Amino acid sequence: PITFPPEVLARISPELSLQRHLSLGIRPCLRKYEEFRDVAIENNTLSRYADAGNIDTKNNILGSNVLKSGKTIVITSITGGIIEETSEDIIANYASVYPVVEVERGRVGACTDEEMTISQKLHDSILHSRILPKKALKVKAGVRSANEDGTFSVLYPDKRKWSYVLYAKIVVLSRTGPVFDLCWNSLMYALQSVKLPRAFIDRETYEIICDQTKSVPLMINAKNIAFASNYGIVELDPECQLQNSKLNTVLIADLDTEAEETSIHSTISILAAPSGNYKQLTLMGGGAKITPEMIKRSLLLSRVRADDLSTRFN
């Protein structure tokens, strides 16, 4: 009786592996249909403001997050810069971060389609979910006036304009499936931990420089913070069903384990807020027919997942 390990079976016949597992009410990732992977978070451990008592001088990380789901790890770090500005709920008044996603797989070289699309979609979804107002990125410049004559002190208000620019570096270790959701959630927690450094100043122009210790809260709209979910729609093939000693379709949550990623072509992805509103929805009917029922169950599961991810910490 010839036999293949689950790994190499997932390599050889992903569809058959998926169907066979689903015939037993389980998945090749050893979770049942609507069972998410648990998540664990280490928040603000890499930031320079990690320790208020002993602030790291060399560090330039404004925000930090370390997420772990299943066996996949995501490390997100928020750095910053300043741009000189020139010259409602509408989208014009909102901002976004500029993320660089680095999914650690065997290769070395320029960005893959995965990394590029995940980065861009992170940016765009941050913009459209309206989590970060442009107003919150405005810098209130203090001025460095000289102590008597002999050194220098800075005065902040309790004359050009300026704006904060946030950058995100997101590295993904031990990828086993689609990692956009993990990146989004990690970036959310990371954004919640960001502290904006205070800034001061002295055809010719003087540079603006950030204060070493002082920092103000990055005030984001907590109302609009959503969390990410993904789902697969699988059509059961009668021949590949196990004996377990007329067509059916099942909904699957939190895809993983290659067999699922290779076989499933009908996918749903949601950014859902704890309040009840939805920030993003993506339907791709590459395989099985996407019915309204599936959409509704997906929205339900996305919202409970959102409540879960927003409540489980603090």
Partner 1 sequence: FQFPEIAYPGKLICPQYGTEDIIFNYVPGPGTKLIQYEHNGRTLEAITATLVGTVRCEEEKVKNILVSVLPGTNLPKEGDIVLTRVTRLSLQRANVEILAVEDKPSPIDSGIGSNGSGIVAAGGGSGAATFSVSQASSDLGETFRGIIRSQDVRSTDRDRVKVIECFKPGDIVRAQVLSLGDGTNYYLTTARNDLGVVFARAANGAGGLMYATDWQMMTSPVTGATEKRKCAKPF
Partner 2 sequence: DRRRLLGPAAAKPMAFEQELSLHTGFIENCNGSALVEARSLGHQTSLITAVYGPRSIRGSFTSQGTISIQLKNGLLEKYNTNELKEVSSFLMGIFNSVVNLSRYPKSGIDIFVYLTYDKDLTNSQISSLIPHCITSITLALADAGIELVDMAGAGEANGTVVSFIKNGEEIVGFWKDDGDDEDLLECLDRCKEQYNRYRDLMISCLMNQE
Partner 3 sequence: SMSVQAEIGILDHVDGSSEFVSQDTKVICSVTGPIEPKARQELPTQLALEIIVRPAKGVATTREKVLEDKLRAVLTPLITRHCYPRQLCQITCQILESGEDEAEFSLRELSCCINAAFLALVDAGIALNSMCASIPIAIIKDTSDIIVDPTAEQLKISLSVHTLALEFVNGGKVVKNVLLLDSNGDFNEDQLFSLLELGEQKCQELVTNIRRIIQDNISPRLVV
Enumerate binding residues for partner 3 (CB under 8 A). Answer: 89-92, 113, 116-117, 119-121, 124-125, 127-130, 224, 265, 276-287, 289-290, 292, 295-296, 299
How far, CA to CA in Å, does 48 sit from each of 1, 154, 187, 254? 59, 21, 17, 33
Instruction: Please choose, from the candidates 219, 231, 221, the residue with its C-alpha nearest in 3D space to the C-alpha of residue 277.
Output: 221
Nearest alpha carbon to residue 278 among 266, 267, 270, 289:
270
Instruction: Report in angstroms how near the CB of residue 123 gets to partner 2 at its nearest.
Output: 6
* Tokens linked to 177: 């499936």
In sequence order, what are the beta bridge partners of 77?
64, 169
By CB under 8 A, the residues from 120 to 179 that bind partner 2 are 120, 123, 165, 167, 171, 173-176
Q: Please report, as residue ranges, which positions from 170 to 199 form the binding site for partner 2 (by CB under 8 A).
A: 171, 173-176, 197
Residue type, 257: T
**If contact means CB under 5 to 8 A according to the sort of partner, which of partner 1, partner 2, partner 3, none does residue 92 touch?**
partner 3
CA-nearest of 141, 145, 164, 166 to 154 is 145
Residue 37's binding partner out of partner 3, partner 2, partner 1, none, with CB under 5 to 8 Å set by partner kind: none
Contact 10, 258 (CB under 8 A): yes
Q: How far is the CB of 128 from partner 3 (least distance, A)?
A: 4
Q: With binding defined as CB under 8 A, does residue 54 bind partner 2?
A: yes
Closer CB to partner 3, 13 or 280, in the complex: 280
202 binds partner 2 (CB under 8 A): no
* 59 contacts partner 2 (rule: CB under 8 A): yes
Q: Which does 77 bind (CB under 5 to 8 A by kind): partner 3, partner 1, partner 2, none?
A: partner 2
Residue 38 per-residue DSSP state: P
- Integer-rounded Cα Rg, in Å, for the chain is 24
For the bound state, the minimum distance from the C-beta of residue 228 to partner 1, rounded and expressed in Å, comes to 15
